[PDB]
């Protein structure tokens with residue numbers, strides 16, 4: 563038990579709704595991680611205050627959504643400066659190989675520098691989409 567709220571943030575057309583699509587403008591489901599149960603609610607300023615974890619999604623095929631991550635992250639951390647926020651940077655569209663603008667290594671480097679987790683996903687194909695919402699659950703538990 564325990565209720566976990568997870569927020570999806572990022573520029574338009576990076577895949578927020580599609581990612582929430584694979585889980586379920588909110589989606590509520592009872593899931594199981596490392597052999598225990600939890601209700602996870604995925605949301606696609608009162609947002610800032612109630613969120614347990616934040617998924618900052620960019621498209622790996624869109625370099626303008628990558629560059630905007632640092633500022634999105636800092637505005638967010640500024641919203642609760644006393645809090646240690648669990649944050650995952652989600653490199654979506656990992657399937658469009660020939661359209662890529664952002665490598666795995668720059669994305670990983672971005673994450674470490676900024677103290678978040680990193681994961682690449684394809685929401686169109688449900689690749690790493692289960693691990694994404696699972697990693698979210700794990701970070702939130704650590705904060706409890």
Ligand SMILES: Nc1nc2c(ncn2[C@@H]2O[C@H](COP(=O)(O)OP(=O)(O)O)[C@@H](O)[C@H]2O)c(=O)[nH]1
Nearest residue numbers: 574575576577578579580655656657684685686
């Ligand atoms: N190839 C590919 N297309 C995707 C992926 N995720 C989303 N899209 C497409 O990109 C467009 C925008 O997705 P959407 O969820 O509306 O983005 P939003 O603006 O964050 O809500 C739609 O055409 C999606 O089908 C992905 O992982 N791979």
Ligand SMILES: [Mg+2]
Nearest residue numbers: 575578579580
């Ligand atoms: Mg949308």
